[PDB]
């Protein structure tokens, strides 16, 4: 078999290969990841920082 | 006492409940012991010393 004969990739390829359409699809799935991860990081740093504020018993003696 | 407010009782109701008990206060100007009614920052007292 000649090395100029590429194997069969037909059953894994997209039948309509559009650059703009196929890139917007992939970036929308990583943006969803980055949106939720950025939301979960805010709730993590807020949980630890807020534990350093005045406790319930201290606030009662204001 | 303050943890019952907004959970099972009203603020004005818990205050009345706490005022029916007595707690140690700061000594007076001569240094004798004193007592005072309870506040919201106090803890629920037990029956035995
Ligand atoms: C809801 C969020 C989506 C998550 C669901 C997963 C998913 O989309 O799987 C698609 C999946 C097929 O996509 P694939 O296997 O990744 O390959 C298709 C190619 O991407 C071939 O398609 P493509 O890459 O050319 O697609 C371009 C894209 C175009 O759409 C976009 O670009 C999205 C708009 C961008 C917003 C900015 O169109 C879509 O795929 C529509 C969005 C989905 O669909 C299914 O397998 C159907 C499952 C239904 C059964 C449900 C019962 C359980
Ligand atoms: C802590 C959680 C923070 C989550 C932040 C997620 C985020 O903002 O990711 C955005 C970018 C995207 O990363 P990318 O996949 O290389 O984007 C492709 C570049 N285009 C073609 C779009 C210009 O990712 C980056 O720029 C690198 C972020 C690394 C963290
Ligand atoms: C560096 C140490 C990191 C430790 C991470 C341990 C993760 C183990 C999973 C346990 C759940 C999270 C622990 C409690 C944190 C929390 O706050 O979870 C509560 C939050 C929502 O709560 P809230 O915002 O409504 O209330 C907060 C009180 N005002 O849930 C989430 O957003 C889950 C999202 C997790 C994604 C975090 C991604 C990593 C960020 C790193 C920076």
From Swiss-Prot, chain A:
Component of the ubiquinol-cytochrome c oxidoreductase, a multisubunit transmembrane complex that is part of the mitochondrial electron transport chain which drives oxidative phosphorylation. Belongs to the Rieske iron-sulfur protein family. Residues 1-20 are mitochondrial matrix. It comes from Saccharomyces cerevisiae (strain ATCC 204508 / S288c) (Baker's yeast). Component of the ubiquinol-cytochrome c oxidoreductase (cytochrome b-c1 complex, complex III, CIII), a multisubunit enzyme composed of 10 subunits. The complex is composed of 3 respiratory subunits cytochrome b (COB), cytochrome c1 (CYT1) and Rieske protein (RIP1), 2 core protein subunits COR1 and QCR2, and 5 low-molecular weight protein subunits QCR6, QCR7, QCR8, QCR9 and QCR10. The gene is RIP1. Processed by both the mitochondrial processing peptidase (MPP) and the mitochondrial intermediate protease (MIP). Initially, MPP removes 22 amino acids from the newly imported precursor in the mitochondrial matrix. This proteolytic processing is then followed by a second proteolytic cleavage by MIP, which removes an octapeptide to generate mature-sized RIP1. Residues 60-62 are annotated as: Hinge. It is found in: Mitochondrion inner membrane. It comes from the Eukaryota. The chain holds residues 31 to 92 of 215 of the full protein. This is Cytochrome b-c1 complex subunit Rieske, mitochondrial.
From Swiss-Prot, chain B:
It is found in: Mitochondrion inner membrane. Residues 20-49 are annotated as: Disordered. Residues 20-29 have a biased composition (Acidic residues). Belongs to the cytochrome c family. Component of the ubiquinol-cytochrome c oxidoreductase, a multisubunit transmembrane complex that is part of the mitochondrial electron transport chain which drives oxidative phosphorylation. Component of the ubiquinol-cytochrome c oxidoreductase (cytochrome b-c1 complex, complex III, CIII), a multisubunit enzyme composed of 10 subunits. The complex is composed of 3 respiratory subunits cytochrome b (COB), cytochrome c1 (CYT1) and Rieske protein (RIP1), 2 core protein subunits COR1 and QCR2, and 5 low-molecular weight protein subunits QCR6, QCR7, QCR8, QCR9 and QCR10. Present with 39900 molecules/cell in log phase SD medium. This is Cytochrome c1, heme protein, mitochondrial. The gene is CYT1. The chain holds residues 112 to 160 of 309 of the full protein.
């Amino acid at each position: 078999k000649s090395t100029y004969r590429t194997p069969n990739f037909d059953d894994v390829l997209k039948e309509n290969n559009d650059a703009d359409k196929g890139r917007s699809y992939a970036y929308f799935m990583v943006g969803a990841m980055g949106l939720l991860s950025s939301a979960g990081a805010k709730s993590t740093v807020e949980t630890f920082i807020s534990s350093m504020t005045a406790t319930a018993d201290v606030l009662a003696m204001a | 006492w303050r943890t019952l407010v907004g959970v099972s009782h009203t603020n004005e109701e818990v205050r009345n409940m706490a005022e029916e008990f007595e707690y140690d206060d700061e000594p007076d100007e001569q240094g004798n012991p004193k007592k005072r009614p309870g506040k919201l920052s106090d803890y629920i007292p037990g029956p035995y010393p």
